[PDB]
Design a protein around this ligand. Sequence first.
Ligand code: ADP
Lengths: 116, 115
Amino acid sequence: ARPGGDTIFGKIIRKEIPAKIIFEDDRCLAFHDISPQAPTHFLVIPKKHISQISVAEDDDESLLGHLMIVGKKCAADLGLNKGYRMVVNEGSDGGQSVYHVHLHVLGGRQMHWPPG
Amino acid sequence: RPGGDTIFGKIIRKEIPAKIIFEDDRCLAFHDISPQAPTHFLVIPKKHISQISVAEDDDESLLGHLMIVGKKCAADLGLNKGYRMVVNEGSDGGQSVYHVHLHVLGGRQMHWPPG
Ligand SMILES: Nc1ncnc2c1ncn2[C@@H]1O[C@H](COP(=O)(O)OP(=O)(O)O)[C@@H](O)[C@H]1O
């Protein structure tokens, strides 16, 4: 197991391929999504490879919460003052495509209900 | 006031009924009264945080706890094919109640975009 894991996100974490990075620290990375579904759409990912939220450990609590705090801070820095939606997809019914935990943050338009 | 002045505060205080799934010292999980999937529940902190935008760095572990409780409840609700977790902020996010809440939806295919 490489730092960052074996998915495409591991290449982003290891800087092998570029991404438009909003924030980085020793625990996580936030970057814009290349297939945006809203005028602003970014991802916050842990540097630790957790494949899916369903396999997260109890002591990954802090890390998961950090993703959300980083998300909210990045949303504010990106000017999302009218609101936004955070999404985590799990497995096939959740529409998860990349098996590395990631938090979507979408805003800049009205989001509708249901959320897919 | 502890747990707040929203309907979710009333639920936490047991003043009105809810379809409670799980409780601990710091959070409550209950089925959404307006479900959008065959399983649709909420995980909420007992601490009244109005919205994710005002959460503080010291709330990190509590927020993560909502996600871990959500995953554990999803498993005990039979959701083995997946699910979607959602936090709405503000008007554009479609936030319905100004008390932080994590939605967990599954039991059907969730689609893209997520609203
Ligand atoms: N190299 C990349 N840079 C930015 N976004 C990426 C890259 N590769 C994948 N993505 C995005 O990663 C996201 C993965 O989320 P998942 O929840 O796994 O799938 P989807 O949500 O597309 O059905 C998608 O929104 C996709 O565009």
